[PDB]
Amino acid sequence: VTALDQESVGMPAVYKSRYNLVEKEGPVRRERTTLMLERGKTVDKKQLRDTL
Amino acid sequence: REIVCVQAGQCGNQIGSKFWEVISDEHGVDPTGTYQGDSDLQLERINVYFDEATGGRYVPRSVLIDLEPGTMDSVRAGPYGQIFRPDNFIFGQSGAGNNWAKGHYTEGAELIDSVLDVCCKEAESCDCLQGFQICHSLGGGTGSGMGTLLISKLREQYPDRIMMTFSIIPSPKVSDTVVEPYNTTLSVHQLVENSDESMCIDNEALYDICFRTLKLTTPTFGDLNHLVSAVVSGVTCCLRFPGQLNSDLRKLAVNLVPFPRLHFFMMGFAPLTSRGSQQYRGLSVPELTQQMFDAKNMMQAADPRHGRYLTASALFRGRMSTKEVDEQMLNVQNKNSSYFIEWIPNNIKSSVCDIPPKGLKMAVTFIGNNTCIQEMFRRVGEQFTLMFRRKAFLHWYTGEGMDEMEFTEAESNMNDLVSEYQQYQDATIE
Amino acid sequence: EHDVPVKYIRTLDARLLPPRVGHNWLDAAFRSVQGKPQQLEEEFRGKRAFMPPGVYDHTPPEGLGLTARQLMQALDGRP
Amino acid sequence: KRKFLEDRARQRDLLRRRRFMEVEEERRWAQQDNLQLRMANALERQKE
Amino acid sequence: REAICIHIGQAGCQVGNACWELFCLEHGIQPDGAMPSDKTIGVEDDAFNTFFSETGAGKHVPRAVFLDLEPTVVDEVRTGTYRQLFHPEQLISGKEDAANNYARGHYTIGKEIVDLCLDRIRKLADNCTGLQGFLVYHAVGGGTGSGLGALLLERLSVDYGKKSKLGYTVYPSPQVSTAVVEPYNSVLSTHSLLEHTDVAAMLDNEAIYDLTRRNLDIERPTYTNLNRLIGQVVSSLTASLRFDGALNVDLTEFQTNLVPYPRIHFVLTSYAPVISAEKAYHEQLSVSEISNAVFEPASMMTKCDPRHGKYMACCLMYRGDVVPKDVNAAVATIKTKRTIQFVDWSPTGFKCGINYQPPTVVPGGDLAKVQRAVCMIANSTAIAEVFARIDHKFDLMYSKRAFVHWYVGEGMEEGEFSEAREDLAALEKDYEEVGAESADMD
Amino acid sequence: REAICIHIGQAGCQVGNACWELFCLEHGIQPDGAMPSDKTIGVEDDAFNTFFSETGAGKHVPRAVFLDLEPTVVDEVRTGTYRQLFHPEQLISGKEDAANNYARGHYTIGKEIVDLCLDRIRKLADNCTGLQGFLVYHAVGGGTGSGLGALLLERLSVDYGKKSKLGYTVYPSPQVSTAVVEPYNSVLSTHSLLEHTDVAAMLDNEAIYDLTRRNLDIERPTYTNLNRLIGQVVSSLTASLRFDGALNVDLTEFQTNLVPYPRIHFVLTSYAPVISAEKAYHEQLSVSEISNAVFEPASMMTKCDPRHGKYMACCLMYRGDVVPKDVNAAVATIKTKRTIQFVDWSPTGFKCGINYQPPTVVPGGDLAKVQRAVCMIANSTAIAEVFARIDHKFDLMYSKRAFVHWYVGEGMEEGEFSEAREDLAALEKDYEEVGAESADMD
Amino acid sequence: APPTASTFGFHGTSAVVANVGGENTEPSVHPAKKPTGTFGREASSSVNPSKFLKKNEGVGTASRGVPIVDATKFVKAE
Amino acid sequence: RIAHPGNHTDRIPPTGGSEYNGTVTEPWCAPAAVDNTYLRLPLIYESTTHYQQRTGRYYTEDQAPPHGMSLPPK
Ligand SMILES: Nc1nc2c(ncn2[C@@H]2O[C@H](COP(=O)(O)OP(=O)(O)OP(=O)(O)O)[C@@H](O)[C@H]2O)c(=O)[nH]1
Ligand SMILES: Nc1nc2c(ncn2[C@@H]2O[C@H](COP(=O)(O)OP(=O)(O)OP(=O)(O)O)[C@@H](O)[C@H]2O)c(=O)[nH]1
Ligand SMILES: Nc1nc2c(ncn2[C@@H]2O[C@H](COP(=O)(O)OP(=O)(O)O)[C@@H](O)[C@H]2O)c(=O)[nH]1
Ligand SMILES: [Mg+2]
Ligand SMILES: [Mg+2]
């Protein structure tokens, strides 16, 4: 099965096993979690009121 | 939906050669057997009459039977003869002698097993089998005897299919054979019990068509067999080409036969006109209907004015409106109301097919069930009684082995058929 | 350009007309030789026969993709 | 409304064109008959 | 929202070709099932959902089955231009016809083909979330249309129960006829249509031929013209589900308003602006003019004269540029006429529907382009004369058992003719009784 | 984690060839046993471990034995394309066949070969750390498949004990037939499969032919198509062991959920998107449509109709892009159906599994490429009808002792015919009794 | 019970897919199995002039008016 | 006036849609069979419903794609 997104050089696009999922979904989920943690620390009420 | 053809006797083999020429032309098969057509519409129903042989070729699903190979030897060396499968020619070593008893009992029982073996071999190959079709004369010897023998065996073996016959019948003015009444009476007895639908043609009517209508200077049997092949190929046209209102042999039988014994029909084909006259009249549905009921275009000696129509069928070929067909059939029924049986509200069925015969813009074939056919049976019964009371030529048939009681049964059955037609002609509502 | 050219109108040939009633120029009863053949007996004895040639076409399909072409192509101890 | 009027106009023009074409077609059918008639007559004369 | 179409035999499949060409051209689906990739109108509206489902690959495919016992017509659909639109399973074809015998279709041949039909209908009904009825097109004059249509309606009526079944039926014309055995098939058909249909619309080809000669200027019409008119009528009735409007009408509101008693469900149909392009420029076509048109008997698609009976209910569907005040003024003008009569027990005789989408114009069509149209379906006691001519023709033919041996050979008891004839006689007496004034209070 | 496949006789070896072709192509192991360096699988990954072991140089070798009495088919495997993949010890071949005699295979010839089979199987089982069952492929119609399969299952059941044994069996078709003596071999076979199998899946070649003619568009199918379908089914069932998913299903869960009583272990199998590429692009393929598909009898790989019985348990395996809401909605819709009936003692009739890996497509024209699939194994009383046709054919033959002298000459008592026929009769009575409603509380 | 939705064993008849419903019926109205097929019978021995065809003794078919379908184990629609 | 031009000076110009071979985009070609030379083959060999399927979406029959004499239309 080809990948949903083009420009993907990996021929086995969908080979989700245990090892593949741990070694690929560890870093991405950890990066999303740390981005959410640090990015939400600087809350700005004035900018939120401006967006509203 | 495949048909199996059987050609028996001299008349049957000769008409068959021209029929297979016309059919091979309509599906674009070269006389070498190679497909050379120019539209897929020709190829998409080729299975109906042809089986496919390797590398392009087509072979026709027909069995040829005769007691002497002379006619079959001529057709084989004829221009289209090569198309026929060699194993399909069955022949004996002595003639029928124009005698029904000889053709039915002595050489018939000798050859019949090989004919039934070939017909069964051909029938079991079809994915769905439609009725059988046989062409033969009733006045002859091998045509009448072996045709009715084979019909009886096929009716025992295939009672759920359709049984159709095309038959040549004796002229009212001149005989081609002296013993015609015996062969005709016995054959009509066999057909009236066994057949589902039988069409009758008089050679006198084909001679009158050629001389009076087409004004041919030097007509030949090729022309008569072409007229027969034209009507025969027309009745089956809706089975093998698309159209606005499809039709089928069983639907024709269901609409034409009111009671099971009344299955003998008259035939006609409309677009006949001399090359000199053709410049003076264009083809149109009113013109086809007028010619269709015009006696110049009808293939029997009996005239409708002495009887009444129980039912009729018209098959139209060509691109044409259904409205014009419907109003023409209504107008003919309304203007000539005395010639149509009144206790049936509509006697004519219509059908329309898109593909006309080559070189004609449109054509129609007409099938009619009319009580004037009773005059033919009455005439044959009279001639039979004249010969039988005096034992005119009976020793040939009795010497073959027939019981005289067979002749009285066949005469009684024909007399009851004439009585039944006469009773339905004069019925009334009250 | 769409009409029939004059080479087929200004000649006398009987093969251009389809068979029909009244088209009886090329048939029996007009041949110069009217002898009756004995073809069947000779055929069943096995010393004469008909066998027309057939037709076979060897064109390759067009528009096949890379995968289809690869599928068509699919079908010593030294270190 | 203006767009509807233009569409109706072009439809009427095209129907008129089609009505012309059918009358143009019938004569070509007649020619198809004529060619065969002529050839048959010539062959008959040769046979005579 | 959704409706499933069932097409049976030759008339039903040929009318289906005209219906699906029109529904494709009205929504904008190309004949190959793919919408134009460059046509970005701006908002991908859901209106197609009434007639199309998507295959997940983005193709649209229609909610229809084509049923036939002979292969020719379905193979013609399979090899034509719309080959890719239909799913191949939807086009079902047998090997051989019912040979104009209702008995052959009902007992012998349709019993073999019916289970494939039920499996396809099952697969369609599972791909719906608001199915609100079946539309059925067939002719009762032929063998497979009558026999298999009756058998299939019986099976649908047991399996689906309350779901509605609306029929478009081609009835035998009063003097134009195509086959000899038409009376037997029509009599045997009417018992099933009586028991297993919620509303039945009656059509006669002779009326549509008269309409195409008189209103359009066609001297030699053929079935494609009639089928295009039928497709326009079906599109008008189903337009209320598919486009924006002032007063929508769901098919259950139609059934609630049009049927007074459970057996009184046979209705007449008519269509107003049947007009040619050359006539269209000599006349304005206002709401009141087309409303006056639907009530003239020259506008009807069934050969019956409604002046010989009384109306019980009328349902008027307007599509295009119409304003409700004009509909009210038109209906108020109709009520004054003395040659239009309603039964005294039906004081509020009208139901209205108003939709903004004007009727579509088909490039090879014969109808003109118009800004508005109205379609009417009405229930009237005049239908009693329609049943009487079949009963007289059946009595004339059956008195001599003219063809009964075919029916008895194909599996039917001779008694079934008399039972059906007595049931249609009771329906005729019901239409005589309902129209009787309430002179009981005197 | 690991499972070992045992292939016996002609059908079992050819189906094994198709299976290992599929498992190689899905994991990506080259036919030389290596793995190309350009793939993104990774050296560390373990998903192969269920079916392959590495020697440490990184070549792969499969956990299978191929058993036959005639050389020709295994020599065909030895000379084919996968020659270098298999270890030569795994391919075991005798000299001559069991000649359609169960007695010859069981008593005379298989007794010589059976000890070699056990030594190789032991050598496999010693190189495992989580073996969780045997998969066996054989046909019960032939002599060596019946006789050596029974003898080997008996020996395995004594030697390995509690380890599970799941069978895929090609049973004699109900009217397609290949040999005269099929009923005798199948009756004598069923006693061993009854005693010595934990779950038995029934297959009929006539059903897979019907599925490939009807669903696929193949005019001229051959055994490779059927074997590829079987390989797809086994890959679907074992996918739950090999890839991540929302709701996993261990091989012990099949036996725990599907088997109510220890004798009631014969199960029906079906597979949903058996569809051609041209049909697949004509249809959407949602979860609920394929779930509806696995319950139609046209989908089954055994020639039985489940409408003549009652379901006791169903196990539904979904693989690919599926969401739990669609599984729940599908199961609730199935429960709603009136032609699907469960025994009243089994209220919670379903087991579900959900795996993210979509089914692999093997080059060729036998299945479309699809993002999701569902596979079903189900226990139903309808299977008793399958046995009854074999018993009728046995009774017909046994009434005249038509062939018994061969069986008695090769070492079997005449009593064994009557014993086997009475045991299978008792299996029918078990299926009659289990399906009887609990009317004891009245 | 005969197998359901089968594609084997009804050659030569009008059926396409046999017995979808799974009931006790023949695959088709026309006989799927007959006494004799392509092997044929003996017709030379069965024709004698002393046992000739009698009046109203023809073969009984559906066109004549005899319900042949009632003699076979084919379930008709009620 | 089209049917009977006579000696009128104001003749109707041809529309350009009607041709003997039936196609406005392809010239005349010799047929495979000799007896089909005089026939209008692209017009004879077409069913009515196929004609209305192909020509339905065009105001005029010459705008339709050519028939092609093929079982599935080209
Ligand atoms: N309006 C219209 N009427 C049609 C059409 N086709 C057939 N009819 C009419 O319907 C009746 C014939 O019914 P058929 O559809 O031919 O019968 P059938 O369904 O084919 O049944 P079988 O003959 O057994 O196959 C006649 O009155 C025809 O005039 C059509 O396309 N449009
Ligand atoms: N599905 C499938 N069925 C097969 C295959 N090979 C044989 N069969 C069927 O299985 C039965 C024949 O069994 P065999 O496997 O040939 O018997 P055997 O195991 O070789 O036994 P012996 O003949 O004694 O060697 C028949 O019903 C065949 O149709 C196959 O490759 N695939
Ligand atoms: N129309 C037509 N009638 C023929 C033909 N050949 C023979 N007949 C007629 O058929 C009858 C003779 O039957 P025949 O075929 O000789 O019987 P057979 O001896 O059994 O083959 C006579 O009425 C002939 O006029 C023919 O080619 N065409
Ligand atoms: Mg029909
Ligand atoms: Mg073997």
Side-chain angles (χ1 to χ4, degrees), chain D residues 25-36:
Chain D
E25 182 65 26
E26 60 185 2
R27 68 180 65 252
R28 296 195 145 83
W29 283 112
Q31 178 86 279
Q32 179 202 257
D33 293 331
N34 188 35
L35 284 169
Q36 301 179 91

Side-chain angles (χ1 to χ4, degrees), chain F residues 113-435:
Chain F
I113 301 299
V114 71
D115 289 338
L116 204 68
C117 307
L118 281 296
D119 190 359
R120 297 76 184 279
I121 285 295
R122 185 69 63 82
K123 185 171 71 213
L124 296 179
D126 288 347
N127 195 351
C128 291
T129 302
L131 175 157
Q132 185 172 2
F134 297 92
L135 306 184
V136 188
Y137 294 167
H138 64 115
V140 300
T144 191
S146 58
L148 184 58
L151 179 61
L152 184 61
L153 286 169
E154 292 174 354
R155 296 287 295 284
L156 256 58
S157 178
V158 178
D159 193 349
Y160 293 106
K162 39 170 66 50
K163 294 293 184 183
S164 62
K165 302 148 191 75
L166 287 72
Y168 302 75
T169 67
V170 181
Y171 184 75
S173 178
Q175 65 175 358
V176 171
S177 66
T178 297
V180 182
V181 302
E182 287 165 2
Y184 289 6
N185 299 334
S186 53
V187 298
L188 295 165
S189 172
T190 188
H191 188 54
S192 169
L193 288 61
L194 182 59
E195 287 309 327
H196 300 283
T197 311
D198 296 331
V199 181
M202 291 299 103
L203 303 168
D204 193 297
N205 290 345
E206 200 195 329
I208 315 179
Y209 287 139
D210 294 1
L211 182 63
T212 50
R213 296 178 70 188
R214 292 189 291 115
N215 280 42
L216 294 162
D217 298 300
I218 299 163
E219 290 290 345
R220 214 61 61 67
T222 191
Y223 290 137
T224 58
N225 305 98
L226 284 67
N227 296 352
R228 285 185 170 138
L229 267 62
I230 295 166
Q232 287 279 353
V233 175
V234 67
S235 184
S236 187
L237 186 68
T238 320
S240 186
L241 306 188
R242 297 179 295 138
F243 298 100
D244 196 348
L247 293 172
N248 293 115
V249 182
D250 176 356
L251 298 188
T252 60
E253 298 294 329
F254 295 125
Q255 88 192 31
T256 302
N257 284 276
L258 165 70
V259 179
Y261 307 102
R263 286 165 64 91
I264 309 297
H265 66 60
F266 298 89
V267 300
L268 313 176
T269 177
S270 65
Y271 194 86
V274 179
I275 47 165
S276 66
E278 182 65 26
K279 293 171 101 73
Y281 167 83
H282 278 117
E283 184 180 3
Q284 70 86 11
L285 295 172
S286 69
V287 174
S288 61
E289 318 302 334
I290 67 176
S291 301
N292 283 358
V294 304
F295 288 89
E296 295 185 351
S299 174
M300 307 265 298
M301 297 187 286
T302 175
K303 190 79 211 153
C304 187
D305 185 352
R307 295 177 293 182
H308 293 66
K310 296 176 183 67
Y311 289 103
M312 301 172 277
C314 294
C315 173
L316 286 164
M317 287 73 80
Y318 294 85
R319 76 184 294 195
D321 186 74
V322 305
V323 175
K325 302 321 171 178
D326 281 348
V327 174
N328 292 349
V331 172
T333 304
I334 295 298
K335 293 179 183 287
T336 302
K337 299 288 288 184
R338 165 210 72 238
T339 317
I340 294 178
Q341 297 176 20
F342 284 83
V343 295
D344 76 6
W345 58 260
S346 188
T348 55
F350 290 87
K351 175 65 171 66
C352 303
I354 298 180
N355 195 269
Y356 297 125
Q357 181 68 3
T360 189
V361 178
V362 61
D366 44 16
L367 286 164
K369 185 174 312 312
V370 297
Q371 292 214 130
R372 62 180 70 80
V374 57
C375 173
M376 184 179 176
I377 312 293
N379 200 337
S380 174
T381 64
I383 209 159
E385 300 191 355
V386 179
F387 298 121
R389 297 153 173 98
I390 295 307
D391 292 336
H392 177 64
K393 303 184 154 180
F394 183 85
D395 287 8
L396 287 171
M397 305 205 63
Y398 192 66
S399 73
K400 292 262 177 293
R401 300 299 194 283
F403 288 86
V404 305
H405 74 92
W406 294 112
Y407 291 79
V408 179
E410 273 303 356
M412 187 180 75
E413 283 77 31
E414 188 276 331
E416 294 293 332
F417 288 107
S418 179
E419 179 157 21
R421 181 58 184 92
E422 290 180 359
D423 200 329
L424 189 154
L427 186 69
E428 286 149 26
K429 189 69 184 294
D430 292 333
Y431 284 112
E432 263 177 19
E433 292 184 348
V434 170

Side-chain angles (χ1 to χ4, degrees), chain G residues 24-71:
Chain G
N24 270 0
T25 190
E26 293 179 353
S28 177
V29 184
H30 300 318
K33 42 171 51 53
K34 314 182 301 323
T36 175
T38 186
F39 285 176
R41 324 182 173 164
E42 291 77 9
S44 63
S45 59
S46 69
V47 62
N48 280 359
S50 180
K51 67 181 178 67
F52 72 105
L53 192 160
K54 294 262 161 43
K55 167 82 176 184
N56 290 332
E57 289 275 355
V59 59
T61 71
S63 53
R64 313 296 301 292
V66 170
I68 301 299
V69 73
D70 291 331

Side-chain angles (χ1 to χ4, degrees), chain B residues 94-105:
Chain B
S94 67
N98 279 15
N99 179 329
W100 189 98
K102 173 176 291 324
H104 196 83
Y105 288 120

